[PDB]
């Protein structure tokens, strides 16, 4: 894709439109969460903290999910850095995208009216081949991740761990209103 | 493709021709609607609101359709931002392209005389594999999307939900005149 | 594979069979591997043939199958229930999915499993793809749910259990030993010697 | 697959089990309807008429559908030959399989209790490439086939053509009881 | 596919595959595409049947989408050469060379079943047209000669003008059994 | 390909050679007509109108054809914008390329002496799969497009619709002289 | 394909091609390959043994094939004592036309709508390797080209110069044109 | 392969079946396992008292397929003697050890390998599905070690150590371990 | 490939080496003639005419051939523009490359001593599939192109059309001396 | 690969390292000889002649061979331009690479001590398919090229044509010392 160039008035500085929005403390997570796309989010979050530790960071999420470890690098960076990270769901926040949406600062988690939010237990975090001993190890690691994600989700949503265990058993699709009632987001934007 | 470079008189500034048209508040949606192409539209819509919240934005659509969630990120951005988003159909506006065309500000939805506008119920928003329980969930989510799109279309067109349910059952191709009579567009441009 | 040839002794002469035709002569029908239109129709052809050879004698239906098509399995199932002779079922190796269904479909009191066999029951997967328009996907989703309910209902009947029990237990792949299948109600006895 | 061999008592004659059942006037249509599988059915129907024109022929159907022209070769052979062709649905009779099921002699069309019968308008009878003139021709031929199949179905079922046009619009799945009520079969066998 | 075996009663018993049994009754099937191999089997059967009985009719059952022109012409010339009349019957479909061979049956003995589909059209590629413009010219000329030959023989079969077949074979011309009868491709439509 | 850089004397400005020719109001349509290549032509046509609404735009066409909807986006832009769009055929103008050639301002449609111009009815505007009902819809849409293109061609050429229907039935190749006599172009350039 | 079985009264059950071989009919159908050519040779040798005096009927429906494979048939036809009559069904192209013309003079036939095509050979094998290897293979192909034109000219009672012109590019002939050319002697009708 | 005919005319494997010799050659599949079962059933009837000779040259295969053989061997009345030719690995070693105690043989240069099972089927889907398949694989692992330990007259703890990774044994080591009873020479 | 950068003394201007040679009025046609490579030649020829209509343009050809329509866009541009286009054969000028070589201004067509020039009738200008009617049309168009190319070649070479028809029947390879004697080039350069 | 950037002291000018070495009149031929890689060498040779017709050009060769026509474009350019072209073998000079090495100015052809020089008759200059008449033509053209290359090699090496015909029959590998004794190079560099 061709990324448009925009001019900032200050003299003038030419930006690509995403660098221009980063200047406004807007970080996008678009598409699958990968090591590379997650590390760019982390780099942007770290950079924005240095620019101004007190101002909010706006983390716009339009993602079907992705790697758990990659999503956790974002998650821990969001919680670590001093400035509040506000999260906004555009289009969809599914799987780790929903996790990172719910991970925003409480009171500053938003969704657009027709966005779709989906929460579910993790799938393969990696293949389970090799010997039964190797398969046992990877099955145990996946269960620990499953419990960790449900526990952190339950914390984000102010719900019991038992509720998240039921609700993430199979793909649980929610409207913005249902996500608000559930506790994944705080507000729904209109204008 | 090689994107031409044009010179803006002000000193001089060299733009690619799409960045030059963005300076005139023209945003293009060309080809399939994807997370990446939809997020560029959103980034441009957000940027243009900041530049001037009062001036109209011109959203030129030549698209066969694409992802619903990606199209909804555009749709909610169009409705959220203060400036009116005028929509123009070039070549075709099909599926989510027709939805976004109809989503323009009422009275400012345009089509060119020989453009083709097609509305239809959604197809797979994602595969339906796994167990019958998973297939049930995805079938239910697709039906909710189907109803949401028909409901929003009916609102755009000032028609009954029952009319959109009939008319989107199978691919419904319309000339610019038929789209105007239907309520998808307001005017047809000639000169 | 090369299927061995065996000689059946009759009066002053010998008939040469492949070993599976020889076992069919003893009223043994094998369902081995996936259930397909072709493998299911051979079972049906054998069941029909055996009923006529002797409507009163039991038929022995040996099952070693991971599952397969529901409609193909239902052609066997309805043939088993229709024909006059009792169809005894035996699980060798495994009876999974429609293989477990056909195992449980044997004549009550004559459903067997070998001691180390594995029996697995679960809700059906795709009976066919769900593409096309949302209207087509709705239709296929509804048909799959009707099949799901039909299979759980027939399973519950076979096992003398409540439909609610089969709905829980077939939600995800439910693996059972021969003893667990006997306690569940899928089989009646476990053979040893 | 290995087709078992069975011995007929008469001296003795060794048959494959399908030739043995043909001796009992049982003809199987299993799997897709193709030129080759349809011509075997025709060859068997012809052969059985010569053996005994007065005795019924039993046509066992377990088929997802197939070619219309191939199915029509069976259909016309069934109607032409003197002996009644009784039809039985095993597992499924879908598309042309349902057509041939309904084409059995009225009063002798059977289904097993858990069989599945599906009727629908035809899909591509052949690709529609080439020039718009060629596409027009193939579209017209497909519509003529569509009307012919609905008309013959309506005749088989003692229903109005308008009913079959509604009901074959999209895949219409029926239980044996629903097929009996519809008019596709006459009886449901149990024992 | 498994081809069933049937038993013929005679003076003893003989076991046939069902197609060899029908050949014994002078029924020759052309099913599926016309290829060198499928066409040569038809020719071998036509030659064999002439020798068995030169006076009795041969019944040539056609269910074919078309195929090679040269392969179809080997059948066509064999049909016309051998003494016994070759009656033709359309089952399912007779398209392209299948329709040609259907129309090539003995006049008065060309049949179709009521719901059969008969399609006539000009030939497509009889072979690729690559190489040099000189080679392409040659193959284009050969294809046009074949086109004219097929329309001329069709017009003869149908008792129509060559000009009519040239119009009607320009694009795929689908006909019901009734339309094929009116056109002149078949003589009768069977019902019972 | 490496696109040469040329220097414009004014100070100096370095252009790629196509941006340099755009500065002279020359727009190229080279190769297949796609959404992307058509939208660049539209962007250039819109840009040139803004630069000078009165001066002619020179639209150089060397194209085998392409998408109808993409070509129609160019076509409607050509007719909409105030400045005359002169069209020149280089090498070939086939299918939608011939349509856009004939769409130039009457009296300003040119071809080079050895160019090749080919007009024909459209092929598939999209596949015709699915159910016979879907195939009927797409066949009807293709016929409407066929009629629309012949009608607009007949208007461009000052011919009867009946003439274009004959002449576009199969690929109709024309020399520049034959295209001039037909009415697709007005003049043939030599020097 | 399923090859029908027929019963010969004498009973003996044959596949229909073995039944026609009993009548001294040998088929060459499809491409000429080492395997299909060797079956023709085996049948020609067998038939000479059964009766050295009776004609053999060699039915040809072939687009062409290998030259060496076709030459094994050709030399067998010329060697064995009984005349080999040749008939063109459908088509006789390339080596198929060569073998058609190779039939006994006066006994080369074609059916009325058959197509006969003669042309210079294409690659008898690839020409890779070094320029020295390419030179060798080019020379061998030219020798084959000359040999085929020379034998064709002999079959047709024409000058070598005529075959060199006429085989330059694919030369398609009707049965009548092949008869006038000299590839066949008669055209059968009934 | 062309299977020789020996003199009624038998193929050489049907001829050896007449001598109560059943071959398991190559991978254990549903189809190859069911032929062994069909042959074992057939031989029991031809003579319930005479030994059956089960010649094994197999790298392993499906557990469920191997268990159909295993249960048939234990069920039928006649003793099933087992002989290792070339190799008996994985389920092939299991079926070798499953022969009648005192009648399990190996040829001198044969190779016998025992190991825990690998995937009995893929582990995709949701973590809940992966948990189920991991549990089923562990139950199979324990069942195989338990039956192996019974065959070998060893503790379950010994088989759990020794099957952790591919454990290759000579015929002598397999005899000392308890997988076979004797080694044939002449 | 990495295209070297060279510095022009004037201040200094950095060019890629091909843009530097374009500044000297040298246009390269290297490799196959395609719509894209032909349009760059046309763009360069048009540009150079504007820079100086009187000075010669040097068109260096090292090409195996390519599309006829693409080559004709170059050919007509060469003949149209006022400045003489001198042509030089480097390595090879085959098929349309030989045509464009011979198309240079008479007296200014050059070849290097060990260059190879090959002339031949065209091959497929496009596939010949579809119906015999479509194949007839494409065969006729190819023959018209064949005659046009031989006629223009004969004009370039001052030979009879009959000579070019013989000589282009099969690939006709010529040394620079043979091409000079034939009439394809005027001179052979040495130093 | 990332091509390093180096700074030239003059103010400062940043070059990629190959453009920097071109400034020193060093032209590299690395890897296979293709139309594109050969034309860059030609462009560089032409450029360097213009910069200084009298100074030597250093042509560094590390090439396994390639196209003959492409190599001949270099060869004729080397011989045409006024400045001597010195050639140096690095790593290897095989096939046309050895030809171009031997083509350097007599007395200025160099090789590094452990370089490998291989001479051989050409392979396929293009495939030999089609008809025996086409194969004859291509075989004749290949033989003419073979003779031309041996003749030019013999001239370069001051040997008889008969010697090169023997020695190029099969791949003839030479050390730098053997190439010097043969006559392919004049000197071997050490320090």
Numbering used by the authors:
A (entry chain S), B (entry chain R), D (entry chain J), F (entry chain Q), I (entry chain P), J (entry chain O): 6 to 15, 18 to 198
C (entry chain K): 6 to 198
E (entry chain I): 6 to 16, 18 to 198
G (entry chain H): 6 to 15, 19 to 198
H (entry chain M): 6 to 12, 20 to 198
Manuscript text:
The ClpXP holoenzyme is composed of a hexameric AAA+ (ATPases Associated with diverse cellular Activities) unfoldase (ClpX) and a tetradecameric serine protease consisting of two heptameric rings (ClpP). Together, the ClpXP complex acts to unfold and degrade protein substrates (Baker and Sauer, 2012). ClpX uses energy released by ATP hydrolysis to create a pulling force that unravels folded protein domains for translocation into the degradation chamber of ClpP. Here, we present cryo-EM structures of the ClpXP holoenzyme from the gram-negative pathogen Neisseria meningitidis engaged with a protein substrate.
Further local refinement and classification in cryoSPARC improved the density for ClpX and revealed two distinct conformations, at 3.3 Å and 2.9 Å resolution, hereafter referred to as Conformations A and B, respectively. The main differences between Conformations A and B are within the protomer that adopts the bridging seam position, and where the seam is located relative to ClpP. In Conformation A, protomer X1 is disengaged from substrate and in the seam position while in Conformation B protomer X6 is disengaged from substrate and in the seam position. However, these two seam positions are not equivalent: in Conformation A the seam is further from the apical surface of ClpP in what we designate as the ‘upper seam’ (US) position (F - dark blue), while in Conformation B, the seam is closer to ClpP in the ‘lower seam’ (LS) position (F - yellow). In Conformation A, the X1 pore-1 loop in the US orientation is disengaged, with the X2 protomer at the top of the spiral. In both Conformations A and B of ClpXP, there is clear density for most of the IGF loops that extend from the ClpX ring toward the apical surface of ClpP. In Conformation A, clear density is observed for only five of the six IGF loops, with weak density belonging to the IGF loop of the X6 protomer (white dotted line in Figure 2B left). The lack of density for the IGF loop belonging to protomer X6 in Conformation A is likely due to conformational flexibility and sub-stoichiometric binding of this IGF loop into the ClpP-binding pocket. In Conformation A, there is strong density for ATP and a magnesium cofactor in protomers X2, X3, X4, and X5, while the X1 and X6 protomers are ADP loaded, with no density for either the γ-phosphate or magnesium. In Conformation A, both the X1 and X6 protomers adopt conformations that allow the X1 protomer to move away from the pore in the US position and there is reduced surface area buried between X1 and its neighboring protomers X2 and X6. In agreement with this finding, the local resolution in the cryo-EM maps suggests that the X1 protomer in the US position is significantly more flexible than the other protomers.
